[PDB]
Amino acid sequence: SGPVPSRARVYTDVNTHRPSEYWDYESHVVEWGNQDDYQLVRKLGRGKYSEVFEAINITNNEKVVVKILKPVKKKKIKREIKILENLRGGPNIITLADIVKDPVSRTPALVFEHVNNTDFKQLYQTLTDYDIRFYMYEILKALDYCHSMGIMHRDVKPHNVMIDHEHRKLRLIDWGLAEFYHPGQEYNVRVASRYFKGPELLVDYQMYDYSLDMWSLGCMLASMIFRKEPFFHGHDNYDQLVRIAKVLGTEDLYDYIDKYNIELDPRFNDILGRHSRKRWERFVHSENQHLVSPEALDFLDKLLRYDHQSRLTAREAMEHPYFYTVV
Ligand SMILES: CC(=O)NCCCNCc1ccc(-c2ccccc2)c(Cl)c1
Ligand SMILES: Cc1ccc(O)c(C(=O)O)c1
Numbered sequence: 001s002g003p004v005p006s007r008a009r010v011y012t013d014v015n016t017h018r019p020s021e022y023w024d025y026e027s028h029v030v031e032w033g034n035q036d037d038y039q040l041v042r043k044l045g046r047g048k049y050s051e052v053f054e055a056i057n058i059t060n061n062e063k064v065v066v067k068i069l070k071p072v073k074k075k076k077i078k079r080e081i082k083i084l085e086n087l088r089g090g091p092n093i094i095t096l097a098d099i100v101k102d103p104v105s106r107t108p109a110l111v112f113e114h115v116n117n118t119d120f121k122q123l124y125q126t127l128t129d130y131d132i133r134f135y136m137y138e139i140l141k142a143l144d145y146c147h148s149m150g151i152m153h154r155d156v157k158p159h160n161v162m163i164d165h166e167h168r169k170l171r172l173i174d175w176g177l178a179e180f181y182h183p184g185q186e187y188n189v190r191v192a193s194r195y196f197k198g199p200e201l202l203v204d205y206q207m208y209d210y211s212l213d214m215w216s217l218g219c220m221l222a223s224m225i226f227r228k229e230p231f232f233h234g235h236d237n238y239d240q241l242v243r244i245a246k247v248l249g250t251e252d253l254y255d256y257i258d259k260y261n262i263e264l265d266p267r268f269n270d271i272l273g274r275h276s277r278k279r280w281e282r283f284v285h286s287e288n289q290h291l292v293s294p295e296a297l298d299f300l301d302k303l304l305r306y307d308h309q310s311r312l313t314a315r316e317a318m319e320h321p322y323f324y325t326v327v
Contacts, residue, residue, distance in 0.1 A: 031099065035103075038057060049070035050069050050176070051067075068102075094172065095112060115164055130326075136322075143156075146172075154192055155176070155178070155216075181209055187206055197237070204263075204265065215308070227288040238267050248277060253272075
């Protein structure tokens with residue numbers, strides 16, 4: 001007949017009960033600030049259709065971040081702007097401070113609050129079991145917030161989590177892939193970065209929800225506690241699912257596709273194979289045992305599940321025993 005419909009177990013109808021003003025980002029009126037208020041200092045990085053710069057707001061001598069967008073698609077820019085304005089002030093959500101335009105090049109730029117990112121490659125060795133529990137909890141505060149506001153981030157990964165370790169400040173950045181959750185809507189599966197992509201995306205199941213973010217979060221936690229970057233190392237989108245199946249096993253994959261009447265792409269036939277369900281304890285080694293505990297393993301087991309409906313919600317995750325040591 002076709003695939004079985006699905007819906008989020010929490011915050012299902014938050015957008016349904018809100019005016020069109022909230023979620024109709026295409027109708028949203030954007031108002032430009034003064035580009036001249038900002039002096040570009042240095043290039044921070046380069047994205048798909050963006051160039052990120054450290055800058056100074058010369059009207060208050062304050063450091064800011066300017067993300068210049070290659071205006072490839074207007075609807076996309078408007079969606080990012082609306083979502084950022086809706087979530088502004090939310091816990092651990094990057095604060096959009098201004099929106100500016102370069103008249104000569106005819107290029108939009110989003111201006112954010114500055115975050116001093118502490119070096120990731122130097123964090124990895126010194127970091128403790130407590131530090132992982134603490135920053136995991138800070139990310140879930142950002143997720144429970146944006147999901148309660150009817151938004152899925154759809155690009156949760158270490159590059160999109162900024163940390164100022166000195167001040168124990170975390171921010172969830174780059175809301176360029178984020179979308180308003182409407183029950184029953186069929187979304188584009190070309191979202192998230194390969195390693196972080198949930199099985200729903202890999203099997204082309206379009207009626208996904210907030211729970212997509214909880215899978216990406218589980219990939220990050222597995223990678224941190226096991227010191228294995230990335231945890232699921234696919235070489236392409238079909239291989240990515242094969243890497244998951246090498247961990248979760250192929251039996252539960254068939255239970256997932258059957259439950260939702262998903263048509264597996266024929267490209268999966270020769271590469272899928274047969275895989276047994278692995279124990280999480282098998283990934284424990286001398287290099288990572290100080291970060292691993294039974295609470296961490298029970299928590300991870302509750303996030304990394306094929307069935308999107310069966311994953312912990314951000315709020316259920318915050319109530320898990322893994323976070324009993326955090327405030
Ligand atoms: C734009 C830009 O400069 N990005 C830099 C990305 C910086 N990433 C560093 C980092 C460090 C720790 C974690 C983490 C993960 C799981 C639990 C606890 C902490 C994550 Cl997700 C990311
Ligand atoms: C602070 C900061 C740095 C880089 C970025 O790309 C963003 C963002 O996308 O929101 C934010």
